[PDB]
Amino acid sequence: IQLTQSPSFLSASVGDRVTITCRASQGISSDLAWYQQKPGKAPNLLIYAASTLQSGVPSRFSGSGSGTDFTLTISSLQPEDFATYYCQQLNSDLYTFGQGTKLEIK
Amino acid sequence: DIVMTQSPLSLPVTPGEPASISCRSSQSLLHSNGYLYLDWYLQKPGQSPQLLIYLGSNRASGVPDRFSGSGSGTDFTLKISRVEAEDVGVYYCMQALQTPGTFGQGTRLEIK
Amino acid sequence: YELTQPPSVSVSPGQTATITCSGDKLGDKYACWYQQRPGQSPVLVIYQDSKRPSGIPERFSGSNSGNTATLTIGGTQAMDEAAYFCQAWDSNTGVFGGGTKLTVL
Amino acid sequence: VQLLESGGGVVQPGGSLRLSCAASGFAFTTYAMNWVRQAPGRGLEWVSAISDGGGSAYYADSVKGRFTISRDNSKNTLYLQMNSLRAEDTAVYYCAKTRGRGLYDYVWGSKDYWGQGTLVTVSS
Amino acid sequence: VQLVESGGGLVKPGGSLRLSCAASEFTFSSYSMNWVRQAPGKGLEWVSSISSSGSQIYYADSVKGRFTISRDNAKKSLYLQMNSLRVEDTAVYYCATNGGAHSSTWSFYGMDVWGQGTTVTVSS
Amino acid sequence: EVQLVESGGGLIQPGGSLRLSCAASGIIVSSNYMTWVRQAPGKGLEWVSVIYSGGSTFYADSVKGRFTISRDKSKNTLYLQMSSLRAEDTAVYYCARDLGPYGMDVWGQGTTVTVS
């Protein structure tokens, strides 16, 4: 399967509403995990099953979409909310990731 | 029956301040297998409750980090780190040990 | 289904006792009777409405017909003073009678 | 996850009703369910709970015999039998699922997700 | 056989107990067991019953959904799970054999061998 | 509480042999799905291998015939036999625990492997 994030380089100031899109080419409908990676650090779960808040993630992070469309929504940005954001195929055999979207506190 | 009493009946607390809600069980709710079967609920005004604290000291998925529970045997306390404007509403405790499921009477944390 | 027994009956020692048991079409069913002397676990004394278990003297006579089950005790003595439970089975349900207390003077 | 409660309205004192908790977005095949009532301004009070596949029918005293519950494990729905309704059951009814799916997570215990509730009014 | 019961004690309403009725010999296998409770002020009540094989299990109307009779012919023991012990369950329980192998032949026999009863008390 | 620590990578001649290690505290390796994940410099994450809780193994198309995943129940550790190393194997590898519908809940710090 092929996962495509859109778009790669993304910029906004603090407080903006961001919508990072990882687009599923076939349509899987429940198998997404949102991976935020501080530059040169260890990634962490943000939303698993594409809609539910993984424990300890602050409530400003949300996920939405099911089927062929999927999105990452951040309700209110923070100066530390810059990272490279990954989408992953859950319940798979190759665990295909996306290319990576680099949000920038700009 | 397990009749549970909350303390106190009302806690109007300004936002940013800390708050503790205590509810004591008539019987012992400890160690059905080793845990404390008391659960904490918040019914925000006009909408349905969801779990805040389960098993006395632990919380469910996605709960704000400010909430924490404590106490063993019969005395149990909820510990809000910092009251804010979304925390308004009634708080319930429940004994989760015996089949007759009894809730508290309802203490609101409000903004005074 | 309920079985109705009189609360208690009494006869003088050496007499003949008669204790009844009532049920709806009870003469079509098998009824057992038990003896509960106070402070004692009960003992079966009559089953199948006519037969008498091993270890019981023949003066424990029971019969059934119509809507009444009856037990007859000729030559009643002192230790016949006991609780008497008429039993019956209906639709795989163990239902006990009221239990008639027999008193000897 | 959605907990759509159906039925409910104005029923007659001593009459009859049946309530539906249509659930979706989760298994419901290995999850227990709970029924919770709340008379107007009187607090959450318990009614009922069921096991993963029925059979385990757990009731309070005030609903002894008079209420019975069932589930449609194929269609993923929860049901609730009512008879001879009194005036103390005039309330809004919540169907709620237990946290979880293992044993010692009591089928009458923690209630993770709740519904929107439907009002059941007994009057004339 | 020679029967001895155990397990009766002080519990509060809604609590859990698990009685027992142990046999002396292995002739236990041929006996369909019955549980009969005796009130402190009244006579006897039939509680439950089980077949010799244990596949024909019946309960009284007042007790289904709460109690769980079970046996083990190789263990020569008879149990009675005692859940939601409730206000009028305080009594002395008797374990009595029927002799009839299956529920279809219970009416042809009577409960002959009773063990020493065990006192169960529920109160706050 | 749940920590993965990795060692064994380093600068190695092309086509050579090497092995990684991944000690685990808290998680038992011998009954959970452990995966090897690769990240080339200037690139993103990519899957390498997974060994099942029962012991069944799996590797990627770019990995088959070259690498081997291995374990130890006594030390609660995860290994990767590194062999026939080409220039494309220059990457940083992390060990993660696979739970199916649940994502890679815990991760390792990572070790840099360079080919020259």
CATH code for the domain in which residue F102 is found:
2.60.40.10
Q: Cα–chain-centroid distance for residue B90?
A: 9
| Method by which the coordinates were obtained | cryo-EM
Q: How many CB pairs under 8 A join C and E?
A: 52
Question: Measuring CA to CA, how many Å separate A73 from each of A16, A17, A18, A66?
Answer: 11, 7, 6, 14
Distance, CA of F4 to CA of E24 (rounded, Å): 58
Question: Which residues of chain E are within 8 Å of residue B1 when distances are taken between CB atoms?
Answer: 13-14
Question: Which residues of chain A are within 8 Å of residue B64 when distances are taken between CB atoms?
Answer: 59
If DSSP codes are grouped into helix, strand and coil, which group holds residue E86? coil
Two structure tokens written together for B19: 């708050």
F46 forms beta bridges with F38
- Indicate yes or no: CB of F103 within 8 angstroms of CB of A86: no
List all chains that touch chain C, counting a touch as 3 or more CB pairs closer than 8 Å: E
Interface of B with E in 41-100 (CB under 8 A): 98-100
Per-residue H/E/C for chain A: CCEEEECCEEEECCCCCEEEEEEECCCCCCCEEEEEECCCCCCEEEEECCCEECCCCCCCEEEECCCCCCEEEECCCCCCCCEEEEEEECCCCCCCECCCEEEEEC
Q: Which domains does chain E have, with CATH numbers?
A: 3-122 (2.60.40.10)
Residue F3 is classified by DSSP as E
Distance, CA of E79 to CA of F62 (rounded, Å): 61
Interface with B, mutate which of D33, D36, D42, D44 (most B CBs under 10 A):
D44
Two structure tokens written together for E43: 């006579």
**Residue written as token pair 């977005």:** D25
Number of domains comprising chain F = 1
Number of CB atoms found within 10 A of residue C16's CB: 12
**Residue written as token pair 């198309």:** F61
Contact B25, E12 (CB under 8 A): no
Give this entry's resolution in angstroms. Answer: 3.2
Number of CB atoms found within 10 A of residue E72's CB: 11
Domain ranges of chain A: 3-105
Question: Measuring CA to CA, how many Å separate D103 from each of A89, D60, D99, D108, D109?
Answer: 31, 21, 11, 11, 11
Domain ranges of chain D: 2-122
Q: Which CATH number fits domain A3-105: 1.10.10.10, 1.10.300.10, 3.40.710.10, 2.60.40.10?
A: 2.60.40.10
Distance, CA of B8 to CA of B110 (rounded, Å): 13
- CB-based burial, F32-62: b 16+ in 10 Å, e otherwise: bbbbbbbbeeeebbbbbbbbeeeeeebbbee
Interface of B with D in 17-46 (CB under 8 A): 32-33, 37, 39, 41, 43
**Residue written as token pair 């708080």:** B91
Domain ranges of chain B: 1-112
Contact C94, E34 (CB under 8 A): yes
- Indicate yes or no: CB of B27 within 8 angstroms of CB of E13: no
Distance, CA of D103 to CA of D106 (rounded, Å): 7
Residue C37 is classified by DSSP as -
Asked whether the bond before A7 is cis by omega within 30 degrees of 0, the reply is yes
Two structure tokens written together for A21: 């899109």
Distance, CA of F29 to CA of F19 (rounded, Å): 17
A37 forms beta bridges with A84
Residue D58 sits at the chain E interface (C-beta within 8 Å): yes
- CB-based burial, E104-122: b 16+ in 10 Å, e otherwise: eebbebbbbbbbebbebeb
Interface of B with A in 48-77 (CB under 8 A): 61-62, 64-65
- Backbone Cα Rg of chain A: 13
Are C and F touching by the rule of 3+ CB pairs within 8 Å?
Answer: no
**Residue written as token pair 């439950």:** E48
- Indicate yes or no: CB of E84 within 8 angstroms of CB of B2: no
Residue D71 CB partners (closer than 8 Å, separation 6+): D28, D33, D50, D54, D77, D78, D79
Please name which of F60, F56, F80 lies closest in space to residue F68, comparing C-alpha atoms.
F80
- Indicate yes or no: CB of D46 within 8 angstroms of CB of B103: yes
Residue F109 CB partners (closer than 8 Å, separation 6+): A42, F4, F5, F6, F94
Burial category of B70 from C-beta neighbours within 10 Å (exposed 0-12, middle 13-18, buried 19 and up): middle
Domain ranges of chain C: 3-104
Q: How many residues does chain D have?
A: 124
Q: Identify the CATH number of the domain defined by range D2-122.
A: 2.60.40.10
CA-angle at F64, arms to F60 and F67, nearest 5°: 100
Asked whether the bond before C13 is cis by omega within 30 degrees of 0, the reply is no
Distance, CA of E80 to CA of E8 (rounded, Å): 11
Please name which of F26, F25, F22, F84 lies closest in space to residue F51, comparing C-alpha atoms.
F22
Distance, CA of A98 to CA of E70 (rounded, Å): 57
Q: Cα–chain-centroid distance for residue B26?
A: 16
If DSSP codes are grouped into helix, strand and coil, which group holds residue C28? helix
- Indicate yes or no: CB of B61 within 8 angstroms of CB of A59: no
Asked whether the bond before F41 is cis by omega within 30 degrees of 0, the reply is no
Residue F42 sits at the chain A interface (C-beta within 8 Å): no
- Which amino acid, A87? C
| CATH fold group of domain C3-104 | Immunoglobulin-like (2.60.40)
Distance, CA of A99 to CA of D67 (rounded, Å): 57
